[PDB]
């Protein structure tokens with residue numbers, strides 16, 4: 001007696017939470033400790049991490 | 050569409066007990082849901098002898 | 099005998115109470131204590147805990163637009179001033195100066211779920227000979243998009 005509207009459903013959800021990367025900074029204080037940078041000087045400074 | 054039948058039985062078919070079974074080929078219209086639908090057939094004895 | 103008007107009802111309510119974020123400010127008095135800022139001097143000033151962003155239990159993604167409004171006034175006092183917004187857990191997501199005035203620091207589900215502190219690191223050189231007291235520095239925090 002009923003004319004069914006033939007439509008059933010399925011569903012799902014997608015969760016995009018974080019950003020791809022975290023650029024953790026540990027800044028450099030390049031004259032350093034137990035060192036010295038003078039005017040006109042020339043050299044190299046290294047920070048591994 | 051074609052609504053009338055004219056089944057006729059003769060002296061051999063009656064003298065053994067005439068059963069008339071039904072075989073129904075059906076396709077239900079799309080999505081229709083019913084319960085206890087009636088089917089009524091009128092049996093007229095037109096000519097006996 | 100009655101011809102029923104066949105309509106029944108269901109209902110519900112949605113409660114949106116709070117705003118997504120609380121930008122707790124603890125302002126900085128940068129000449130500090132037991133320190134000294136002189137005219138023409140050059141240096142650095144650091145405040146580890148300056149803007150604490152406190153979220154509610156649902157908010158996970160926040161996009162903050164930090165904006166420096168009185169920079170054109172401080173241009174008459176400073177020669178270069180560079181503010182680094184020391185972000186959530188070591189990241190530095192924001193950099194403001196007298197010229198480039200807008201930042202777009204954005205926090206996601208890991209940075210909020212641990213308590214987001216935004217410190218300030220300021221690199222400054224005071225214009226030659228200028229002597230002031232209690233100069234204001236005001237930054238507009240706009241929450242542009244939350245989720």
Ligand SMILES: [Ca+2]
Pocket residue numbers: 018019021022206207208209
């Ligand atoms: Ca992150």
Ligand SMILES: [Ca+2]
Pocket residue numbers: 096097098
């Ligand atoms: Ca007859």
Ligand SMILES: [Ca+2]
Pocket residue numbers: 098
């Ligand atoms: Ca007879």
Ligand SMILES: [Ca+2]
Pocket residue numbers: 116117119120
């Ligand atoms: Ca609030």
Ligand SMILES: [Ca+2]
Pocket residue numbers: 243244245
């Ligand atoms: Ca939104």
